[PDB]
DNA sequence: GCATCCGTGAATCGAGG
DNA sequence: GTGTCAGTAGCTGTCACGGATGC
RNA sequence: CUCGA
């Protein structure tokens, strides 16, 4: 195990001296932002407190070196600088963490990356997306398997730029800038134009938890009155979705390629069977099997 | 008082660039409706480079801006 | 399109090569003028200008001065976006 | 058994059952008592 | 008759058992606690009649523990006493309006005693603004009603634990002596058969180090603990010996880095455990320890401190427990069993209520002031010092503010409906300071314990991550001054039930045997059957002879919560659906008009009244003048009291609190009668929902698994309509370039959108407003250096920007109220604010597709279709049903309640008449005579674990009244014949038809719908915001990304994680390409990944992106 | 371990006071351990992924 | 090292990476998902791309 | 050479305050 | 400029598991 | 913090 470490420095041609720092970097300000509160007071990122404590101890070390303080003070100060840089990089790693106000451990740089709230899992493996919505789901028995019903208001916001384009085309609005105001004021024209926009434009329905891939399926959207999403009764099984308050999210594929992927790969009619077992899922399940 | 990473503070939020982008998309549509010289002047004291007078500047600026206002209001701005 | 992503130990020289200047003073900002203190954790000479093309001393507030290093405050004149990528550094005694 | 058994299997842990196995094919040597259990195998071909 | 005490509607009960004690004040938990805190006359009288000797008010306790205050010499002294309160600063509603805190000034009497002069100056000192508890048990902090939740904490005392080693598979034992305050001390027996002690978390010292520090000789130690080889081995394996040696050995482990003086250690080792300064067991702690060790069992609770005797007897207890002993008598003490303690048992799990939680914060503030006083004494002169110069009340007010404002226990009151508030005030939380962390709560703290019987409810508890950590107080439960939860029991003398009721704690109850409430009893008191069901110590249930019963339960519903007791036929529902029902009753939305349920349980009356959201008459009299605004009562003696109604007030949760008078002009009303009821109330009973005509059948798949079908009647007649009120708020501050001004004159805004505004830019009262409309016109001056080049050009080719208060998306209603505060007009605003406007918008929400309904048995669903009144399957006489429940989602859940509830429901709507001729039928022999005849729309009660039996219900279905035409529509099975309103043909089979109580839960699509094209982006990560309120987007999580990768939709994944999120340039070009009609461009790089790189650099990691050639690219 | 005393009553007959209380042990621990089971399952899932 | 740092033991992986001076050949689903390249699967493989 | 103790990990999305 | 005693709160009510850490 | 599937 020691060789595993030493041979690294040997081959790669990087010096082990790197493990001891002569200079520490300062992260750009926008990543340690300082915001103002509605009461006139200020709130600041924890990194600022940590960097500040380190700077204080470093400048005090400069003072002590210049003033020829007793060796005890210089050494006992260098130790504090060590502890402070340790805290900057991975607070709490060694011993007791640096308590903030309220005996709360301050977040370190390496705390910006670990776990669910870390950069990796929170902001890289999964982002938040434009052109998306969510609402309560309702069973729509008259729907076909490839169809789903979404509220008019939802689709108007989702297809907002498309509606502006078509409105300015058919001269319902003078310029695109005015088309936007039309959509935001919800003038009655859009509802006849919106139908043209949503025509055969598939959308993706997701219900968390997204256990297997059939937890996300594609549908042809149908404008419905009301404010709930109408879901086909057969896909319930796939989504493991009852109707006792369950909510679903809708995503609008934009690029031609996204539309093609949804239309071919993810359409609910092209995903009847269970990828785990090969047995069918969108089949008569409850009331249906009883009637039959 | 507070800390940003403290659970109880808002988030520096930046607006959605919709308007600015639509404005520039119009401004760019009333630039094809121009002449290359008015264009080169507007996209910039400039009288030192383009090798013309400063009254020629003042004017070209003047008439060009009026052509721009004409086009814009033609579109209904 | 870029093939590989390399990672390795940062030499002191690399740390200094990144930084646009040393953070000497421990101050943050002024709580009245909202201006960042010079050579502090928000020094505009180091990390960048608070607003676009606006230097600290106020001599260059216009877009005409693109790339001028102000002589009275030492701030460069580009977009505030650079306050999201310019590194600082502390030189340890 | 149970879900912890699935974890035991997928993490290649030293299981709970820790059942032994015949390292060489041969004749069984049941030497059961009550104090303890000791079992030997006589290799069906050569071996020890 | 049910609830024949206030003057309430005669609800008839199927009760077989009599109530020997009527329900106590359901709000006593908060009330008595606070009254004890401030020592009100009511509390002192309650304690005087309870037999208490020298009772102490909370403030009095703090001031006595503090008094007196002396410096190191003792030449100066300061003492406090007699805390009193002036009148309240401002009334409750005014505080809510003006965003201040409800409080009263607290005065004490402090006096300064001078020893070097022999003269004392005693004066009154103002201590601070003391927050006061409303009559409804709530506090008011900065204009918001809050509730302080009772906390379940481990009781102080001595506890023993038997742990099992993982590796050596031997039984080890430990002990913890937990004080009410001070350092902790835990003994243990490691796996080497040696005894050790850890002092304040510090290193594990040998258990003989402590004895040596105390002056005990090693030979005397061998004398006491010689019967155990483990203690001999400890004294042998010991390192240092000597009284002055182990003392310093403790000192250098407890407070390292200091010179060790013999006296400097002798001082703290006595102060940390035997001086009342830095160590104190409350009276309860002393009592608990005195029992567990069996010493001082006769002494009055006066020693608030630990004694050496206690430690010696404790180590004896431990060492004996380790080696199998089962009995011990301390030298000079009573015999006591040797056992481990549960720490989940409600005799060891204490409950500290408001009073105590507040006393602790006051204590902290007071000690913080005490230190400042001791410093200020040795500073100022010793002749011009007054209590006023010594006292710095800053830390005390800061302490109470820090508690109320910031604490897990100071909770924003649940105010959906009165029952929600009541339950919230009767909550028992395990989380919080001194209790435990959520990450430190196993499957054992959370599950029901046999000691919760009659004390905490085993039903009402969240099902989320807080399950078991938050209970509700049982109905008849009360709190004793020590903190444990007492419950009442009827004393059984000689197989004879007595009306004598005694309250017992958990450990007190375990020392007897109690019989289940529903035991057959003689009219005199003797038990009919010799064997009776009985609960026994350690939660053991078994039969026992009648001559063995000591006590018995008060009422059958003794174990359940207020909410739980409101579930009819609860005894037929499974704990899961019953939990859901009790939890969803608290999510009921107050309806425009409220109907009490046909089928009740008796708890509705007292729930409503005790909840405090109704108006009860304090004193008897007559109604002089009644208006929709107020009600004046002319008492008999001659005085008048006027109750003002709260009309269209915004609840904490946007539900509408609106009280209406019940009595009329010139009506005689008795004391305690409800003269006006509020939301979810009808003649003083909890009306959380409506009585709906239900048909249990599948209907064309619109009610497929748990969806619900409703008759548009409920829309037309506003049967499930409810009011919701939103508060909108804007301010005008001082900016760097000027000051924001609220003005009707807004740049580039037509006169048509500004048509509804007054001269100030404020919307006018009564105006209907859609989402996006202007409410308050505020413009803020923007500087020139902040303008886009295209913006500056558009300004040149043609200085304030628009910051008006617009209506958020999805909101709409009538503007009912405005409130304006101006720094110019005396109104005190935060520094830098010149004006503030609050606009109140009320929406009248009819029942919509997707709104969530539910019953009382955890039977929940959403509205999947609202059919026209003619489509609904209608009964024989043409009356169409209202709601259609799918059958399939009924027998799986095991909520037979609704079934029963349904049947009785019908019986109550039509009435019945039992055949009295030829005697009383054999099924109704047990029914009270009041139930053999009933008029239609009659009110009834099914008390929990009592009430209607299935046989009696069968009979009642047999004798249901006919309709107006003389026809009986439902069969004795409970089913009736229905006609398909769509085709006309009657349905082939009979269907279960009845009446069920359905509640409108607070999960409406009008709130839960959301959608976003674009909008705000977090500055640091550049990813869209979260939440509907911030107009955010939905999160495409890791699992959903796995779903994408599974399908192989590569381009969709990329598009989701780039142009649709944090591709700064890509998202803009996508918007441009959509409005242009061009194709979607090629996604760029996510800014979040740039952030990752810069962070990895901030950790001295040199990350570089290389191209295919090998050159680092920037 | 199973209680040496059963729940004799059915939901159609009507549980006794103590019958409901003794049912709640199992019901509540069912909900609790189901939460825990889902947690462990999801973690195993992401590992397998 | 990017695929491993995003899984578990982020710090313990990044230290090893910086020591061994590891290079990540950006050719994996997790990694391309992180940086926003088309995943080398389904419609992203070279045959169909 | 081995027991202790350190560090790692522990479901998904969503609402309001 | 500083000068007699002048001394945390809080807390253990999680657990399985592997392997470096340490006697 | 409280809550919904």
Curated annotation (Swiss-Prot), chain E:
One GO cellular component term noted in the UniProt record for this chain: DNA-directed RNA polymerase complex
Catalytic activity as recorded in UniProt: RNA(n) + a ribonucleoside 5'-triphosphate = RNA(n+1) + diphosphate
Pfam family, one: RNA_pol_Rpb2_6
Top EC class for this record: transferase
E.C. number(s) listed in UniProt: 2.7.7.6
CDD domains: RNA_pol_B_RPB2
InterPro entries (alphabetical): DNA-dir_RNA_pol_bsu_ext_1_sf, DNA-dir_RNA_pol_bsu_external_1, DNA-dir_RNA_pol_su2, DNA-dir_RNAP_su2_dom, DNA-dir_RNAP_su2_hyb_sf, RNA_pol_bsu_bac, RNA_pol_bsu_CS, RNA_pol_bsu_protrusion
Keywords per UniProt: Antibiotic resistance, DNA-directed RNA polymerase, Nucleotidyltransferase, Transcription, Transferase
Gene Ontology terms describing biological process: DNA-templated transcription; response to antibiotic
SUPFAM superfamilies linked: beta and beta-prime subunits of DNA dependent RNA-polymerase
Molecular function per GO: DNA binding; DNA-directed RNA polymerase activity; ribonucleoside binding
UniProt-listed HAMAP family: RNApol_bact_RpoB
Binding partners and assembly: The RNAP catalytic core consists of 2 alpha, 1 beta, 1 beta' and 1 omega subunit. When a sigma factor is associated with the core the holoenzyme is formed, which can initiate transcription.
Function: DNA-dependent RNA polymerase catalyzes the transcription of DNA into RNA using the four ribonucleoside triphosphates as substrates.
Family: Belongs to the RNA polymerase beta chain family.
Record protein name field: DNA-directed RNA polymerase subunit beta
């Amino acid at each position: 195990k020691r060789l595993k470490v030493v041979a690294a420095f040997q081959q790669s041609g990087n010096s082990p001296m790197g493990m001891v720092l002569d200079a520490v970097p300062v992260i750009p300000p926008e990543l340690r932002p300082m915001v103002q509160l509605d009461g006139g007071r200020f709130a600041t990122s924890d990194l600022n407190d940590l960097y500040r404590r380190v700077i204080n101890r470093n400048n005090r070390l400069k003072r002590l070196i210049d003033l020829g303080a007793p060796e005890i003070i210089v050494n006992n100060e260098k130790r504090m600088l060590q502890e402070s840089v340790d805290a900057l990089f991975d607070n709490g790693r060694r011993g007791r963490p640096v308590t903030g106000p309220g005996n709360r451990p301050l977040k370190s740089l390496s705390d910006l990356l670990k776990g669910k709230q870390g950069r990796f899992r929170q902001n890289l493996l999964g982002k938040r997306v434009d052109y998306s919505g969510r609402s309560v789901i309702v069973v729509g028995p008259q729907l076909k398997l490839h169809q789903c019903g979404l509220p008019k208001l939802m689709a108007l916001e989702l297809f907002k730029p498309f509606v502006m384009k078509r409105l300015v085309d058919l001269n319902h609005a003078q310029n695109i800038k005015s088309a936007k105001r039309m959509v935001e004021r919800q003038r009655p024209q859009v509802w006849d134009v919106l139908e043209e926009v949503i025509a055969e434009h598939p959308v993706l329905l997701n219900r968390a938890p997204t256990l297997h891939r059939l937890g996300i399926q594609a549908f042809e959207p149908m404008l419905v009155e009301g404010k709930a999403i109408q879901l086909h009764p057969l896909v319930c099984e796939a989504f493991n979705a009852d109707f006792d308050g369950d909510q679903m999210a809708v995503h609008l594929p934009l690029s031609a390629e996204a539309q093609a992927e949804a239309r071919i790969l993810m359409l609910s009619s092209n995903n009847i069977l269970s990828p785990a077992s090969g047995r069918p899922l969108a089949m008569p399940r409850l009331d249906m099997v009883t009637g039959l | 008082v507070g800390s940003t990473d403290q659970s109880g503070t808002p988030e520096q939020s930046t607006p959605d660039e919709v308007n600015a982008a639509l404005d520039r998309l119009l401004i760019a549509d009333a630039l094809a409706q121009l002449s290359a010289e008015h264009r080169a002047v507007i996209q910039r004291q400039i009288a030192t480079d383009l090798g013309i007078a400063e009254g020629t500047v003042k004017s070209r600026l003047h008439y060009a801006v009026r052509a721009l206002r004409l086009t814009l209001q033609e579109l209904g701005v | 399109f870029f093939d590989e992503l390399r990672i390795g130990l940062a030499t002191a020289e690399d740390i200094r090569q990144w930084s646009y200047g040393e953070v000497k003073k421990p101050e943050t900002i002024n709580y009245r003028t909202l201006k960042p203190e010079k050579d502090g954790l928000f020094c505009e000479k180091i990390f960048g200008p608070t607003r676009d093309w606006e230097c600290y001393c106020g001599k260059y507030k216009r877009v005409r001065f693109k790339g001028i290093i102000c002589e009275r405050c030492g701030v460069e004149v580009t977009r505030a976006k650079v306050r999201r990528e310019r590194m600082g550094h502390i030189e340890l005694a | 058994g149970g879900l912890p058994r699935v974890q035991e299997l997928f993490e290649a842990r030293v299981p709970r059952g820790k059942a032994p196995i015949a390292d060489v094919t041969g004749r069984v040597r049941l030497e059961d008592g009550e104090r303890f259990y000791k079992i030997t195998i006589v290799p069906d071909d050569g071996g020890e | 008759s049910n609830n024949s005490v206030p003057g309430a509607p005669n609800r008839v009960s199927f009760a077989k058992l009599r109530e020997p004690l009527e329900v106590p004040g359901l709000l006593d938990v908060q009330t008595d606690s606070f009254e004890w805190l401030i020592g009100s006359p009511r509390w002192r009288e309650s304690a005087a009649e309870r037999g208490d000797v020298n009772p102490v008010g909370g403030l009095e306790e703090v001031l006595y523990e503090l008094s007196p205050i002396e410096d190191f010499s003792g030449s100066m002294s300061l003492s406090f006493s007699d805390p009193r309160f002036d009148d309240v600063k401002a009334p409750v509603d005014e505080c809510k309006d003006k965003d201040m805190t409800y409080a009263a000034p607290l005065f004490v009497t402090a006096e300064f005693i001078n020893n070097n002069t022999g003269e004392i100056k005693s004066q009154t000192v103002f201590m601070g603004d003391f927050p006061m508890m409303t009559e409804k048990g709530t506090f008011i902090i900065n204009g918001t009603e809050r509730v302080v939740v009772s906390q379940l904490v481990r009781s102080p005392g001595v506890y023993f634990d038997e742990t099992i080693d993982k590796s050596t598979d031997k039984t080890l034992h430990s002990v913890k002596v937990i004080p009410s305050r001070g350092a902790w001390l835990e003994f243990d027996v490691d796996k080497r058969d040696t005894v050790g002690v850890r002092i304040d978390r510090k290193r594990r010292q040998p258990v003989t180090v402590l004895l040596k520090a105390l002056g005990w000789t090693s030979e005397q130690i061998v004398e006491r603990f010689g019967f155990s080889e483990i203690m001999r081995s400890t004294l042998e394996k010991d390192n240092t010996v000597g009284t002055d040696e182990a003392l310093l050995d403790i000192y250098r482990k407890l407070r390292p880095g200091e010179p060790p003086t013999k006296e400097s250690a002798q001082t703290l080792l006595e102060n940390l455990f035997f001086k009342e300064k830095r160590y104190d067991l409350a009276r309860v702690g002393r009592y608990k320890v005195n029992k567990k060790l069996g010493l001082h069992v006769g002494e009055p609770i006066t020693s608030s401190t630990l004694t050496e005797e206690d430690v010696v007897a404790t180590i004896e207890y431990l060492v004996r427990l380790h080696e199998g002993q089962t009995t011990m008598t301390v030298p000079g003490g009573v015999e006591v069993p040797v056992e481990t303690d549960d720490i989940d048992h409600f005799g060891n799990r204490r409950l500290r209520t408001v009073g105590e939680l507040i006393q602790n914060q006051i204590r902290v503030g007071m000690s913080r002031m005490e230190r400042v006083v001791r410093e200020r004494m040795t500073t100022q002169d010793v002749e011009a010092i007054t209590p006023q110069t010594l006292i710095n009340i800053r830390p005390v007010v800061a302490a109470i503010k820090e508690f109320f404002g910031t604490s897990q226990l100071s909770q924003f009151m649940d105010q959906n409906n009165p029952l929600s508030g009541l339950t919230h005030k009767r909550r028992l939380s395990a989380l919080g300071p001194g209790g435990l962390s959520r990450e430190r709560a196993g499957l054992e703290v959370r599950d029901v314990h046999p000691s919760h019987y009659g004390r905490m409810c085993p039903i009402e508890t969240p099902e989320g991550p807080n399950i078991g950590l938050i209970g509700s107080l049982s109905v008849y439960a009360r709190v004793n001054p020590f903190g444990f939860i007492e419950t009442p029991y009827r004393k059984v003398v000689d197989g004879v039930v007595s009306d004598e009721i005694v309250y017992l704690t958990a450990d007190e109850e375990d020392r007897h045997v109690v019989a289940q409430a529903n035991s057959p009893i003689d009219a005199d008191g003797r038990f009919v059957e010799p064997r009776v069901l009985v609960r026994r110590k350690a939660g053991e249930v078994e039969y026992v002879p009648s001559s063995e019963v000591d006590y018995m339960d008060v009422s059958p519903r003794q174990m359940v919560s207020v909410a739980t007791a409101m579930i009819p036929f609860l005894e037929h529902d499974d704990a899961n659906r019953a939990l859901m029902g009790a939890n969803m009753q608290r999510q009921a939305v107050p309806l425009v008009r409220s109907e009490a349920p046909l089928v009740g349980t008796g708890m509705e009356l007292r729930a409503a009244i005790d909840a405090g959201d109704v108006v009860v008459a304090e004193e008897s009299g007559v109604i002089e003048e009644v208006s929709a605004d107020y009600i004046t009562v002319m008492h008999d003696n001659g005085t008048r009291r006027t109750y003002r109604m709260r009309k269209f007030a915004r609840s904490n949760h946007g539900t509408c609190a609106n009280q209406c008078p019940i009595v009329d002009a010139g009506d005689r009303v008795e004391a305690g009668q409800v003269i006006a009821d509020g939301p979810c109330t009808d003649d003083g009973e909890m009306a959380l929902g409506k009585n709906l005509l239900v048909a249990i059948m599948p209907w064309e798949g619109h009610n497929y698994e748990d969806a619900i079908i409703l008759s548009n009647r409920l829309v037309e007649e506003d049967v499930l309509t409810s009011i919701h009120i939103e508060e909108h708020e804007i301010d005008a501050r001082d900016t760097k370039l000027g000051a924001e001004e609220i003005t009707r004159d807004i740049p580039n805004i037509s006169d048509e959108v500004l048509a509804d505004l007054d001269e100030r830019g404020i919307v006018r009262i009564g105006a209907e407003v859609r989402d996006g409309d202007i409410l308050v016109g505020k413009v803020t001056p923007k500087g020139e250096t902040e303008l886009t080049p295209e913006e500056r050009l558009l300004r040149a080719i043609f200085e304030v920007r628009d910051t008006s208060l617009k209506v958020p998306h999805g909101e709409s209603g009538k503007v009912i109220g405005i409130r304006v505060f101006s720094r110019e007009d005396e109104d005190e605003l935060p520094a830098g604010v010149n004006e503030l406007v609050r606009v109140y918008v009320a929406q009248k929400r009819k029942i919509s597709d997707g709104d969530k309904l539910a019953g009382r048995h955890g039977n929940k669903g959403v509205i999947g279709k609202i059919l026209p009144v003619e489509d609904m399957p209608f009964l024989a006489d043409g009356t169409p049903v209202d709601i259609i429940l799918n059958t399939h989602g009924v027998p799986r859940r095991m909520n037979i309640g609704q079934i029963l509830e349904t049947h009785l429901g019908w019986c109550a709507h039509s009435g019945w008449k039992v055949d009295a001729a030829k005697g009383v039928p054999d099924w109704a022999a047990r029914l009270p005579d009041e139930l053999l005849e009933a008029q239609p729309n009659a009110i009834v009660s099914t008390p929990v674990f009592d009430g209607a039996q299935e046989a009696e219900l069968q009979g009642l279905l047999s004798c249901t009244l006919p309709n107006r035409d003389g026809d009986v529509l439902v069969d004795a099975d409970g089913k009736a014949m229905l006609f398909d309103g769509r085709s006309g043909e009657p349905f082939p089979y009979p269907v279960t038809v009845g009446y069920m109580y359905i509640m409108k839960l607070h999960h409406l699509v009008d709130d839960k719908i959301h959608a976003r094209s674009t909008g705000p982006y977090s500055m640091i990560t550049q990813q869209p915001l979260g939440g509907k309120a911030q107009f955010g987007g939905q999160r495409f999580g890791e699992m959903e990304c796995w779903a994408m990768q599974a399908y192989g939709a590569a381009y969709t994944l990329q598009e989701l994680l780039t142009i649709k999120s944090d591709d700064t340039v890509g998202r803009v070009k996508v918007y441009e390409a959509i409005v242009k009609g061009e194709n979607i461009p090629e996604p760029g790089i996510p800014e979040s990944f740039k952030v990752l790189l810069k962070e990895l650099q901030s950790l001295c990691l040199n990350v570089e992106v290389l191209s295919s050639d090998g050159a680092a690219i920037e | 371990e199973f209680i040496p005393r059963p729940v004799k009553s059915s939901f159609r007959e009507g549980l006794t006071v103590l019958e409901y209380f003794i049912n709640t042990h199992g019901a509540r621990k069912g909900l609790a351990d189901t939460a825990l089971r889902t947690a462990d399952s999801g973690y195993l899932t992401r590992r397998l992924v | 090292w990017l695929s491993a740092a995003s899984f578990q033991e982020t710090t313990r992986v990044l230290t090893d990476a910086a020591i061994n001076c590891r290079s990540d050949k950006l050719n994996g689903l997790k990694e391309n998902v992180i940086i926003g390249k088309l995943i080398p699967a389904g419609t992203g493989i070279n045959r169909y791309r």
